[PDB]
Amino acid sequence: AIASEALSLLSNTYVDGTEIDSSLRIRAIQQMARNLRTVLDSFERGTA
Amino acid sequence: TTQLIQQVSLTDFFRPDIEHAGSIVLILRHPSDMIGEANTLTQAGRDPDVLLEGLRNLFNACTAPWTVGEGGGLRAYVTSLSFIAACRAEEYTDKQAADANRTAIVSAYGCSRMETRLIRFSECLRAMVQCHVFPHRFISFFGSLLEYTIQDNLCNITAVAKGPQEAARTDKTSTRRVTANIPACVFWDVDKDLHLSADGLKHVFLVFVYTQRRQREGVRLHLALSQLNEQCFGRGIGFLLGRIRAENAAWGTELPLVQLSNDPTSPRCSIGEITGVNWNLARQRLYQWTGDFRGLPTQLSCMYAAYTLIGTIPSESVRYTRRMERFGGYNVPTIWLEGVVWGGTNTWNECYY
Amino acid sequence: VAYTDRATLNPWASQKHSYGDRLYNGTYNLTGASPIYSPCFKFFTPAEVNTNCNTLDRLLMEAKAVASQSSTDTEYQFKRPPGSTEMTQDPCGLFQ
Amino acid sequence: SDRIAGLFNIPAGIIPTGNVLSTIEVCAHRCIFDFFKQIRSDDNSLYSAQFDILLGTYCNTLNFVRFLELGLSVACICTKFP
Amino acid sequence: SDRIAGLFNIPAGIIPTGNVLSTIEVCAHRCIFDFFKQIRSDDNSLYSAQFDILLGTYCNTLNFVRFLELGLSVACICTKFP
Amino acid sequence: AMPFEIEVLLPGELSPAETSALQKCEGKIITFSTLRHRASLVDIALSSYYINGAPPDTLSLLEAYRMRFAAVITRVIPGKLLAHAIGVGTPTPGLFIQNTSPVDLCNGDYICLLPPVFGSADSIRLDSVGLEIVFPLTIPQTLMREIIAKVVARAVERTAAGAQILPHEVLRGADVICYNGRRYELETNLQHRDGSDAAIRTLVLNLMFSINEGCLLLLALIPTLLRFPIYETISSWISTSSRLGDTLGTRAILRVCVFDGPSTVHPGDRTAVIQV
Amino acid sequence: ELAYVRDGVIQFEVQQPMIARDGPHPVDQPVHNYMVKRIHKRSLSAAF
């Protein structure tokens, strides 16, 4: 799953020019990549 | 998306700078409408003025006692669940959480005639039941607190009225989102009591519970979280409230026609026989049947509960959290629902049988 | 303090629990539900600065922007409605 | 209260952004200020150091299973059929 | 006191100084740690930003009176006995 | 998704007075038997409700406001009427409604239609085509039961003529509806003894013949509680009562949400609403 | 980043001169002051 306020940061709505906002958007992208990689390994375990 | 609603009000029975965001806010019908319904719905031999005095005494130390009349435009519109819970903090089974919440809101508020404000509101709510002016007709769901702005004695409130709770975006201190929450005492999950407890969708009800004996009226409201739909929730309430039902049914109110027709020998008068001279000598030729349905259990004398549906929680499993977190100066146990989608239609269902 | 040869000029209004004090002092909230404005309200009610004792000369910080007392819309002088924002000055509610 | 007197250390000299240009007796206007402390010639409580420290941050990383590197794959003939 | 979480953000100081060698169901030993929070995926409390700031510092500079530069010094004959 | 817009093409030959009248009769609610993208002026008109070749009474109008589809009149131009649907799933974005009722709508009320049971109705007459249009009332859901129970009761005492009950009593008087801190007297400072009862008497009859048979079937079944088929009577009582009750017990269709404005919608006042 | 601040303060440090006098008087010492003010939050809004 992807949270609210993490989907609001991926989809570039409420984009401010601040760096304290890009610092959060990067934090969201990293979590989404983590979760997608884990979900993909789950399919290799499920086969066994 | 969601649906926002905004309303200006006074700050007497509600202080938005203290209540948590996401808190359930109630609205109040005008007070001068209770007088009319009390003047007519009151049972016989019961003074309909106890409500009027308990009402004029509540508002006599609430705010400016002038401009409580008809066409002022400013009025104590809204309350919170915490206020209406702490005013009746002696009727919940969990005395610990009830008294914690009560002592939290007595000190964190103005403390200038705040104890009296809590006492007289409870007296008014009590008096509303012996006059059969039930509180569920004058209190209703407004929304979940989202955004506010305040001045000296004047507040302006924005709340989530319909739609998923976590989709509303605010400028809350830590993060831009907020989830619903309620005091731990008003919480009541019916599925754990009825041994259903299944995993699935739930509803969020707003149930009042009346208990009326002579001069011993007690009113409390809960927030129910059940699997049973709007129609089949009154059964689950009646099975859990089996004592108040029987107590109110008794302590609250304080013809062989099928046989006479089976023989043409009984006295009778066909419809074409009802004319001028037949008038006086008809009401005595027939069978006499005295008596009256006076002094019997009615719907307003046997009522013990009244509930609405205000939202649902459509998850695979309802994850609610009970944590102790403070209203500033005091700790108080709350409950943190997750993923409620507010609904409405504000349709109250009375329970008397 | 002002005239040192006497304790009071009007015994019926300066003593505590007297006629004037019982009638006009706002703490007893006698005319609490009355809508008419009381000119003598500020003369008979004791003041309480939340920091009464944390300043030697708070004459200046208590002499700028007091809110209006009465209403400025109606035909008579009512009390200040619960939503007004007008502001006046009191050279008379300062030196009492 | 005075939590703000304790957010950043009061006498902690960083750099004068400006100069108050007045040189008046400030003991008088004690109240147009949220914190006020008058000190005599170098009195105590000006030499204080006490901090909090984050002494590390540990994490981990997962291992990824390949089904064909396992031993269990002998019992099957895996085929892909879109 | 469990105020321990609230000094530094829980995910913060991003570069990890170590590597946990053992993956286990940590939830079973929840009472070994002083703080514990298990999320499923993307809690909303991960993206929170809130800070305090110091918006300047203002000093003063004293002026140095010279007695001979004044005017009053006319009436005196300033000599200096050692 | 798009809204459901309806285009009522007005005919010519409408007097310049009637066009200015229609220019103000927007925000009001109309109904169609079937919901189409292009309606006509005879589907809105009162002549659509004629049940047995005769104008409808209050009971028939209560039964009609259920089987028809509601719609709110949006902007009106000199050529046509534009109205948006209500019940069907539609995104209708502006959707304001004006208050046609002798009460005040508070911000947050729910609204449900009620035929003009008391006094008169506000109807616009188009004598150029030979048809008129009546508009339903918009009353809060809290009074939707008190109002009907107070206009149907009052019409039973006036039936109690013949010394059956004392018509000389002034002990009980002034049946009012108190709402939002205002008293609406029901006699309307005149005497509508005739004209109003004759248009409600069928509802009163169907309620008399249904309450009177409830307190007698029970007494016939249990004689100790205080050739005449009995099971047929048990059947024909529930069949009639349950089929008459749903007609009366209506549900809400709008809700008064108000930003940036006043919290009370006076009689004959506009306001914005959302779909329940 | 004004939307993110919780509270900001500014600090003052003033010093006062002194006059060396003779007796009988209590000898003097230099006094220093330390102060803190706190920013207030406001807003502005207009619509169409």
Added chain:
Amino acid sequence: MLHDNVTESLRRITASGGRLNPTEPLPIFGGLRPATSAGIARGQASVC
């Protein structure tokens, strides 16, 4: 006072000699507003 017909008679001698006085039938619940006058001449009326 003890007898209601003494207060009800004082509230009439008072009203008959001034112009700021409540509505005649005292409402059982309200604030006793005065009757709004159909004219204003020289400004707000300062009460004494």
Added chain:
Amino acid sequence: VTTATLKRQLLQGILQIDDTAADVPVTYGEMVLQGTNLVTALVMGKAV
């Protein structure tokens, strides 16, 4: 700052005009919150 009546009464013969133009700035300041005090704004909750 005053009203246009007092300004009229003052400019007549009381005050003495000095100029009829002024050199004013035409741009605002700027804060950034970047570099290092962005690090202390997200690990700890403070910045200078």
